[PDB]
Symmetry: D2
Subunit: 385 residues, 4 copies
């Protein structure tokens, strides 16, 4: 039957993650937002505490944690700073592909190292000309003997300048009329390969401590052994990846939303206007309630999507609903949080305007709001067949 009870092991990860977020992230998060330095020390910690690369199988020195587990950890982390957290998350983004489409040699090689040093990796799909339209990418992969020559340009790559290796999706079928299901190939590319031209750190509105970059690939030679499953299987790998990664990204949005709520509640229970506490103005108490409603709903949705994949079933439909819902109410709570703070809310000396800046990517990265509806509509309708 139904059960919304965490396991003992889960409660302990959660506690560990919560302590780290509230005692180590939070007190330093504000400064990193202002400076935009890579939160190296935070990451070195996360790793040591085992709150990084959680999906890596035990056979490669990993913890081999499930999707439910990661979601649980994520939410706690995100609560502190999604700038920091997204960096951690990007590691999982590049790992999953290898986990579901790599061989022992590949995994042992590239996943193994992650388990030894606090190294970082990244996930290169997006190009200047195509983000949402994956089948629209043009990074070319040309076979030349026992090597593949990669020529293309990637954009908005998280951990782009700090990564040891990249998952890279490239078009390997020059036939313009080739199906998406056969036109692409997934590769593992070591960042120190000649032809790899890492661009400047991009300056964005939010999650400013995160490393986001543009990377150019000029005659990058990749050993055939670096092909994940085989030529043409890149699209399958990419899609399969989302089932596992989408629920955790939703969780991160919930942690943000939860942060916003906590802060707004604290303040509403302190500040006075017209002789009453903010929380005593029915207008405000109603706002807070609607805020609370949404957090709980969003949390439920990722849980549902996570349990599903952990149960070994395609969770596309549920996963897409969570990401979509979590992303929208992270944005609504952020702006409502700034609102209860009044004048102080718009000021850089309070923790909420940052929340408002951060939350916005959730509606864009890893499947925009619109794309999510496309997917839900397809999965929904598909059921009437």
């Amino acid at each position: 039957g139904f059960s919304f009870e965490l396991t003992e092991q889960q409660k302990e990860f959660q506690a560990t993650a919560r302590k780290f977020a509230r005692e180590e992230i939070i007190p330093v998060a504000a400064e990193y937002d202002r400076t935009g330095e890579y939160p190296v020390p935070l990451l070195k910690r996360a790793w040591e505490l085992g709150l990084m690369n959680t999906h890596i199988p035990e056979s490669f020195g990993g913890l081999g944690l499930g999707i439910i587990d990661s979601c649980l950890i994520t939410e706690e982390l995100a609560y502190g700073c999604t700038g920091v957290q997204t960096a951690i998350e990007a590691n999982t983004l590049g790992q999953v592909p290898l986990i579901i489409g790599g061989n022992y040699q590949q995994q042992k090689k590239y996943l193994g190292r992650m388990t030894e040093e606090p190294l970082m990796c990244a996930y290169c799909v997006t190009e200047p000309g195509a983000g949402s339209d994956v089948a629209g990418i043009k990074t070319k992969a040309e076979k030349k003997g026992d090597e593949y020559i990669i020529n293309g340009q990637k954009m908005w790559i998280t951990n782009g300048g700090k990564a040891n290796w990249y998952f890279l999706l490239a078009r390997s079928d020059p036939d313009p009329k080739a199906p998406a299901s056969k036109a692409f190939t997934g590769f593992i590319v070591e960042a120190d390969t000649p032809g790899v031209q890492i661009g400047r750190k991009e300056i964005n509105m939010g999650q400013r401590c995160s490393d986001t970059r543009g990377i150019v690939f000029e005659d990058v030679r990749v050993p055939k052994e670096n092909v994940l499953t085989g030529e043409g299987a890149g699209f399958k790998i990419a899609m399969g990846t989302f089932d596992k990664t989408r629920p955790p990204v939703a969780a991160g949005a919930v942690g943000l939303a939860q942060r916003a709520l906590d802060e707004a509640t604290k303040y509403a229970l302190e500040r006075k206007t017209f002789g009453k506490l903010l929380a005593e103005h029915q207008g405000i108490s109603f706002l807070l309630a609607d805020m609370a409603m949404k957090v709980e709903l969003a949390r439920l949705s990722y849980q549902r999507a996570a349990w599903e994949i952990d149960s070994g079933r395609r969770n596309t439909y549920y996963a897409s609903i969570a990401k979509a819902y979590a992303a929208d109410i992270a944005n609504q709570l952020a702006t409502d949080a700034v609102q209860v703070f009044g004048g102080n809310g718009f000021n850089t000396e309070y923790p909420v305007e940052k929340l408002m800046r951060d939350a916005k990517i959730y509606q864009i990265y890893e499947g925009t709001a619109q794309i999510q509806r496309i997917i839900i509509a397809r999965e929904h309708i598909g059921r009437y067949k």
Copy 2:
């Protein structure tokens, strides 16, 4: 660990409720909505199938089902018609108080005869002058020997003119300065008692086959033996009743919402405009997506609240979220379904306009939309103490 998996026992109640709802209710729901006629045959049948009085403990010949089961069943019945379903629901509204505040003697007699015949019962609290403000009821109860004398009027009573007996909440402490927590008493009043004047059948916008009435109590004598826990324990019984009742009303709502979604989808996959199916217009596909999203979110909310109470914990916070959210989306979906149908949707020969009329009570009865935010806010703030 998390689980969203139904038991094998749950799977068959669900199948029983689903077969009855779509093979018996559906085919006649429209004719009942038009006439307003009490659906005795369906109720009769519902009783035989064991889809009524579902919470009655086994000792009293009941099934002794939990809140989760109720919700499961409820949602299927609701799918068919909320007009019919609320009749069923009313019975449970009347029973819970007894089950949580009645002695063995009271339960055996009053719960026991529900199990023997297809009887109905009602819950009498609301008055012409007070609905939301429960602490504002005025139907007085005066202790006269080994009996109580009831004087008052009750309005908007489901199964009002069809009940064998009523749970009746009356003010037993004439001091207007008496704490709500001590001023009321719960009673089991038999409908045939001299002095009960059953009003006319009220004509409402929706749920038209449901019997809703005003009732007047003129020097109604009730044996002190019919007092639930004792004099002054009225409020506690009423408030405690919602913990178990809230989830199931929420399920009815996402039942009527599931109906809305289904119909809308079916039509969208049939109707053509501008040379394409409705579903093929991104504007519609997006609508359907949002609709889908909401149903799923609502479902999860009343599960979360149901599990909680079944776990033997006060679920007020969760139950409020669920009732509030499900009621809202039920209303948005019903209007969007009519929308997808265009001109046919506004027509009485199609199944969605009825849905639109029906869905509105969810935002009113069993704690209005506003009232819910009060509860939520109150419960949420509590957590910051």
Copy 3:
């Protein structure tokens, strides 16, 4: 410069319309909703008072009022009952086409008679297979000498069974690849022409006193002299019509919205809960304010669209915005009105649930909500060219 001041003449129409609506419609509107009788006596009055066929030029015994004028009158009428008002409005719907695409003989003939007796007319575009997609209609118009044989079926025709004559749009170019701009013809069809098979009165959710019917056309012979501008000019006539008619339909939605507000305010300033007036609960006062905000915005929008066409310029963009906005907030106010009324709001003895039933067609008829966005998007984008 700017001016939001009515003229003396306008103030007087407005007063006349307001008195009629509040003193004659209102007190009888409830009964007509229940019975669904055609409000003949109300219409005979409207005519006599000159609140009907206001756009008919003076040369044909009309008042030759502008679009601003009609909007002003409409809003007042609608306030009383949109069931009644829509009947009046349907007259204008069938007249405009003749006004912008007919000749003297035609006008003098068909408009003239309207000015003599309290006759009714209608507007037949919609078919079972096409409403939104005007270019998708299939009512065929075949030239045979000095006559045209009409074979087709129309649906949802307002005044359908009470009309003296119909504006009828038919496809006159059998070439399936003919442009919409040349494939259709507009005709004037006397209702008593053999082949005209008027269907049953349709039963809809709202505006139930309105006559809505299905009409079949079997070998209906129409004199060539009944062609409005000429063969192929039907599409131009249809489109041109909207510029003039859309603002008045928006106005009618505002009158409904305004009615809802008035009623909700009255009640909120009467009813007490928790020791305070409903209007004293910040939660409610905020609801009412948002309600008021929307009415004023919607009123502004139709005014803008009306002034534009009266100024002799295509007002498509503004007109489409008004209809769209007015329609949505008529629906929001209706449901919010039922909400403040609580339990009584869902009851047939109060004036708001009807408002909720009526308001729904505004999002469907005369350009659905979605179609409106299509038009706005086209007109908006067009400006970036």
Copy 4:
């Protein structure tokens, strides 16, 4: 009669403001937002072009423009940058009080020198302890001979560290039981007066080039000659100021919204995904439509409010609607513009993220979003009496 036509004089101010805004502001607004630097050159230029201090009566060398003109101009400037524009706006905030409650002597000296040089002024009311609750300010004024002694602190003062003089609202009646209507006094305080301690430049989320500061008054001596109408007429002057000030702040909002709409449209007509322009995806076309709708609605609202005050009537109701609606849509549009841009939108090298940061104050400053509903509700109910 209605008119939405600008005068020939209005057309040229509009052209002047439009040329300056998009040829001078736009090209440098981004660099000012990054640095936070006060845009003296633009202000200087704005003064020369006569787009500043626009309400100053001609007698004092001003233009003597109405509220409508202000709005017209405001909206164009705002389009360019609200950071720059609020600096301009602040001046007017400081001037109005003087213009409606000052004697000839006061006006000549203080308004007069604004016309001679490019000076700035500020409006000081808000305090660290009270912003929304004006009747809760505590900066005291003690009459000491033919002078007043000011003691208090003011927070969030636009042009705080750049003002020649301030309008300052202080409590002149120590009785805490004194009616708000009689407890305050308005003052013109020169910035160079011994005792004024100008705080640091506050760092906010948006409008970063705008000078916002906290100010402390320590035994500041103000000649009784600097008292506006008299002791106790403070509240009346402040409240009366919003009637004229509300509309223009609303215009700034629909200025920043117009910018959002333009950019979004431009990109949608350039970017391709799934083989089509963004604008060609009904999901986007619909978004743009809604965006368009809102800008137009907001525009009409502050026109309606502007006309009203120019007509010599209290516009509180209308001005509140406008400020409230425009502030909201400004926020929705800014987020939707970032949305249309995808990943580029979140990037600092594109013009919309800034818009998103900027737009938020509209829901806070000059009567929060909540405060506005209070005013509206109060004004609306008044009409039912």
